[PDB]
Amino acid sequence: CVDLAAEIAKHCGFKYKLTIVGDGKYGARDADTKIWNGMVGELVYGKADIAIAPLTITLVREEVIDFSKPFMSLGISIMIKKPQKSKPGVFSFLDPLAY
């Protein structure tokens, strides 16, 4: 997204400052207070003029901010720890019996 930001800035002809989101969040609206945090809050409260990040296009976000057409496609997925099929001893040959 740094390279993408450079490309976008070139194609649209603007100077930009990369700022790390204060809270390290993508952006969510506090239920009760209705306050957006993260980069969404940065846009909502005028702390930044554009967001160039892995910001998921969502309905609740599209209700409060504008999105370009998708530049990347993804889905929720599952990560598991790696496992090894093969593990070798000496006499596991003998292990069915005990010392």
Binding site: D95, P96, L97, A98
Partner: protein, 39 residues
């Protein structure tokens, strides 16, 4: 809600035991008839 390979030495090791008592007695009777009857 709060609720949501090995080896058994013992089992026949007993039969080891019994087998061995069988051994000792077997030899007892053995040398008691050998000594007793023979001599």
């Amino acid at each position: 809600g709060e609720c949501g390979s090995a080896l058994s030495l013992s089992n026949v090791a007993g039969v080891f035991y019994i087998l061995v008592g069988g051994l000792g007695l077997a030899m007892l009777v053995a040398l008691i008839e050998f000594c007793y009857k023979s001599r």
